[PDB]
Enzyme design. Sequence first.
Site, short mmCIF file in Angstrom:
data_model
loop_
_atom_site.label_atom_id
_atom_site.label_comp_id
_atom_site.label_asym_id
_atom_site.label_seq_id
_atom_site.Cartn_x
_atom_site.Cartn_y
_atom_site.Cartn_z
N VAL A 266 -2.17 -5.49 12.37
CA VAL A 266 -1.97 -6.91 12.17
C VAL A 266 -2.46 -7.38 10.79
O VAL A 266 -1.73 -8.12 10.10
CB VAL A 266 -2.64 -7.72 13.28
N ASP A 267 -3.64 -6.94 10.32
CA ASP A 267 -4.23 -7.22 9.01
C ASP A 267 -3.41 -6.66 7.84
O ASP A 267 -3.36 -7.23 6.75
CB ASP A 267 -5.69 -6.72 8.96
N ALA A 268 -2.67 -5.57 8.04
CA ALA A 268 -1.78 -5.06 7.01
C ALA A 268 -0.63 -6.00 6.61
O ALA A 268 -0.28 -6.08 5.43
CB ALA A 268 -1.29 -3.67 7.42
#
Lengths: 211, 75, 75, 75, 75, 75, 75, 75, 75, 75, 52, 52
Positions: free
Chosen positions: C58-60
Amino acid sequence: MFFSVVLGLLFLVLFRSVAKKATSGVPGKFQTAIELVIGFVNGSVKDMYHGKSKLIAPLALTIFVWVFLMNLMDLLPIDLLPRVVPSADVNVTLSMALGVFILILFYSIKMKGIGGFTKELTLQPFNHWAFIPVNLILEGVSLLSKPVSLGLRLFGNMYAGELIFILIAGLLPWWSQWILNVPWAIFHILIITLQAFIFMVLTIVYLSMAS
Amino acid sequence: NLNMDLLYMAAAVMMGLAAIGAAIGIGILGGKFLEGAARQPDLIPLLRTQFFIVMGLVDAIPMIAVGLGLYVMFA
Amino acid sequence: NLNMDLLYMAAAVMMGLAAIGAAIGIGILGGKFLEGAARQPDLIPLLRTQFFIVMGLVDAIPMIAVGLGLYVMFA
Amino acid sequence: NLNMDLLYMAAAVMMGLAAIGAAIGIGILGGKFLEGAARQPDLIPLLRTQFFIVMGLVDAIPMIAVGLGLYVMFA
Amino acid sequence: NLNMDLLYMAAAVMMGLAAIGAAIGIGILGGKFLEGAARQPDLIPLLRTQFFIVMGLVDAIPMIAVGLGLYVMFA
Amino acid sequence: NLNMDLLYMAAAVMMGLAAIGAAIGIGILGGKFLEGAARQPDLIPLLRTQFFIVMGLVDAIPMIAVGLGLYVMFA
Amino acid sequence: NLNMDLLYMAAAVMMGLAAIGAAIGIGILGGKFLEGAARQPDLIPLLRTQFFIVMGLVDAIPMIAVGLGLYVMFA
Amino acid sequence: NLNMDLLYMAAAVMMGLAAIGAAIGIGILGGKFLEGAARQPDLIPLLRTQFFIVMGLVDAIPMIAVGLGLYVMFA
Amino acid sequence: NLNMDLLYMAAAVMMGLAAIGAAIGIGILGGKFLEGAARQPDLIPLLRTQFFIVMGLVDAIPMIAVGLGLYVMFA
Amino acid sequence: NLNMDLLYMAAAVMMGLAAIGAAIGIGILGGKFLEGAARQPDLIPLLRTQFFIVMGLVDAIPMIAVGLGLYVMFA
Amino acid sequence: NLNATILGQAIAFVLFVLFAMKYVWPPLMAAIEKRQKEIADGLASAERAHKD
Amino acid sequence: NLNATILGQAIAFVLFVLFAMKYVWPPLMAAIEKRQKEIADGLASAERAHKD
């Protein structure tokens, strides 16, 4: 360098105050009202220890306690009324000792445990797992920088918060607003310092668990 | 003038809209902590550290947005 | 001037709005971790690694947004 | 100048806002994986492959957005 | 120049923002598949084909957005 | 030129953003179909036709958006 | 003039849109507090402090947005 | 003229969009109050004060947005 | 001309987008009222007044948006 | 010309985006009516009037948006 | 703190810690331990005596 | 245009000195008194038990 040298002087003074107050009140008294609180600090610090616990327990235990103590120095500037060129680059200075010490800290666990004798091996089948070097490398760099980025980010966020609440309070001719802000901001500050000790504990329990 | 005007508009854009994601995301996590502890009170010391980790990771996404905002305002 | 102004506006647009998706998404995952562990405490070491994998994926998506932002600011 | 300015604004628009959908969608899936495994631990090897398939399909929608972004920046 | 600039801005707008809807929607479906199979494992071969149908219908809405994007870029 | 530029910007706006609503809505329906069939497998032939009706009604809202997009591009 | 106009537009952008995230997020938390206490009344003194912590962390994201707004208006 | 036009556009932007967050958030809280009281009627005098606190904190985020709006209109 | 054009654009912006928050929020509350009364019919005269209070507080946030809209149109 | 162009842009802005809130909110209410009646069929004549009241209050928020749209188009 | 003041400020912290450990930790750790050993001791005596 | 913030800080410090001193002291007193009272009670009653 008054606005500058005067600042480093200021933060230095606070840190000294931490150092001496330690041994001095520690030989005495405390006593009991004092003793019981020292129990909160040390023992709660022990519960906090378990979690990371044994590795840095003298090293990190002494450190975190000193971090609450030294961290209160900002509360002092907030406590003042409740004009600068101590606390601006004294606050920058604290952000530098803390964040710089954090970049130093990744290394200190690195050599202190492997960790760093193993951290050179961080690539590992992990860079093979996950076979691409971009993943592992971007990850690790983002980690080393990220530790500094997080800790320094917290430090500067705190210092800045001090400066801003100060601004709002000082400029306004009406006192009441300045008061409500400053009180709320004060609760904010205390929460922030405890959050800092917690953050040290978070990086540290990391270290014990980290790799 | 045009470059300076673009900086101030860009600072507003990057600061406000992206930070909505953690305003929501920090709250989502604390709602899960409250509901999990209400359902099973003995699990409090296990999930409270998870909530802190998770709140800080969600808060880092806006701090990125805020960083770009401050670069546009002051860099 | 016009190209430089467009860079600063574009940096604000790509940095802030897309990063809201992980601010929410990282929180969604940690809420699932907290609720799953509260319902079944013995499943903690099984689902914690899933939460980390999922948070990083998700953070990517924002890190992609941030990458375009930094290219516009500094490239 | 005007065409170049339009490229940089367009790159910011297409890169950031669309990628929010997977930032959320990748997280939705991992939350379902964590909650499903917490409720029924024996179903882990059945649903983990489903989670990977599903994460990759959600991640492909932003990769489309990112592709248009990179075309605007570099093509 | 103005028409070409408008094409590149329009391509960014139509490509990124609409594709967020499937990034979320493909994930919603896979979360339902994972949760449904976790609750009732015997229903896996019945609902897996439903998940594929549904993912493809959700993915077609962005492919429409992407189609307009490519028309603006290359047509 | 200005009218042609406005057509291409308008086509991007109407095509992408509105179509997100069905990308999400088609997925919401299929998630309900999967969860309903997982909870009660005997109700499959009753609710599958409902899912198709509902998907087509949700898909018609974007097809309206796409129609305006194509009018702007080609009419 | 152009720089001053950009300040006032930027102030509106950063102030309003980002603050929506806590308007929602503060409410999400209080809904979790109310639902958790309704389900298990004895857990009230445990989860009320969690709700306050969580509300303040969500409220800090808009206060960042508001800070940028005030800088644009008055700095 | 340009500065005055920017004030009126900025007032519209900051007033309307951010206030959506409490319009939703005040409602989220009252829905939790209604559902909590329906499930457990004896908990009404405990959770009603929580609902009022929570509604006022959510309503303060828009009042910030409205404040910036009024500054732009009249300051 | 420019100031008058800015008023009409600003009126559209502040009127429509913020009012979406109560369109959703008024509905969230009535859904809670309907679900609470369906689960426990004897609680109807207790929670109906709560629903009215809550609907009016949610509706006040758009009425603020509408107020700014009307000021821009007619003040 | 500029004032007339601003009217047509403003009409599009206020008409479409705000009306999304009831498109969602009217549906939220009917979903609550359907789920409440499915769970407890005897409560149908009690909650159907609530659904109508609630749908009309949600629909009034867009009708406000539409009103501003029509004023901009024809007033 | 244009140059070097930050340096002084930080060194005061590092040395502050060392002084705590050398002196406080001897004064602090030991001085504080008295209540631990004490409460622990009286309790332990109580338990053993009662049991036997 | 008045100082008046000193005044505010003072009044707040009044109510908060009441609140602050009050809550901690009953508990903290119970606490330190609890460690000491622990070693003591255990030892005294203990001695009684052993001897008798």
